[PDB]
Amino acid sequence: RSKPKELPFFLQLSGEKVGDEASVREGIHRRDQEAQKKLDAEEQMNKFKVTGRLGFESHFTKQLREGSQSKDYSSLLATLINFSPAAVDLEIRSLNSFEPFDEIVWFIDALTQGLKSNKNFELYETFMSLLFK
């Protein structure tokens, strides 16, 4: 709801638009728009070309992995509470979902430990609802 709002030289007309009722009586661009959308996304990607060297592992997943190694996610709960909501939704949607399901199992472990910790209960349950979303 908050996204903003906004010829060939050889014409190709059809037998009804021109006077060709014989071809009418015996009558026998969405893909262009898809390719156009591919072109606009390509324009966005070649537009942004910042070559600043950034880290491989992000801070959130690094802290989550460290919490799973330590078998305690207290620091992860801390940074989760301190996150910005857009960052929360971007990270939760960009979890990794493979066949071992390591990240999802660790996230559920963290939320169980948090609900046992009994602080910001509204936030922990809305985090789990966002995960199920």
Partner 1 sequence: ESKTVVVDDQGKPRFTSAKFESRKIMVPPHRMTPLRNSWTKIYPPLVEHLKLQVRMNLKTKSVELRTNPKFTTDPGALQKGADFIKAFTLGFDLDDSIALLRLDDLYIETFEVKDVKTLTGDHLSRAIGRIAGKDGKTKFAIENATRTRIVLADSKIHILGGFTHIRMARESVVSLILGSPPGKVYGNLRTVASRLKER
Partner 2 sequence: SQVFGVARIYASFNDTFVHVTDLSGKETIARVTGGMKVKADRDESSPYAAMLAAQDVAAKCKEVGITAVHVKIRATGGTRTKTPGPGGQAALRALARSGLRIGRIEDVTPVPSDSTRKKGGRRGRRL
Partner 3 sequence: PVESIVLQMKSMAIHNIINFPFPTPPDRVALSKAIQLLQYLGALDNKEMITEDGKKMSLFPLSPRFSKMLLVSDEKACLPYIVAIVSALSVKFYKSRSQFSKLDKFSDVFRLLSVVSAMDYVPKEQKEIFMKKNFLRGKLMEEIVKLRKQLMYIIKSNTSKENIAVVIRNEVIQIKLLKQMICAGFVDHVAVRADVLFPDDAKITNRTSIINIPYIPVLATRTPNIEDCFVYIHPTSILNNLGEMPPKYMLYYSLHLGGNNKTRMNTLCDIASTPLANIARKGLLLTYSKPLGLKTVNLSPTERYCYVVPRFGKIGWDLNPIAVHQKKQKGQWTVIKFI
Closest CA to 108 of 58, 63, 73: 73
Cβ-based nearer residue to partner 1, 19 or 100: 19
Q: Which of 6, 26, 32, 99 binds partner 2 (CB under 8 A)?
A: 26
Q: Which of 70, 74, 94, 117 binds partner 3 (CB under 8 A)?
A: 94
Q: How far is the CB of 42 from partner 3 (least distance, A)?
A: 7
Q: Rounded to the nearest 10 degrees, how much is the dihedral formed by the CA atoms of 72, 76, 80, 86?
A: -130
Indicate whether 6 belongs to the interface with partner 3 (CB under 8 A).
no
* Cα Dmax for the chain: 81
Quick check: 124 and 115 in contact, CB under 8 A? yes
Q: Which of 1, 4, 9, 53 binds partner 1 (CB under 8 A)?
A: 9
Quick check: 63 and 75 in contact, CB under 8 A? yes
Q: Which of 1, 5, 19, 57 binds partner 1 (CB under 8 A)?
A: 19
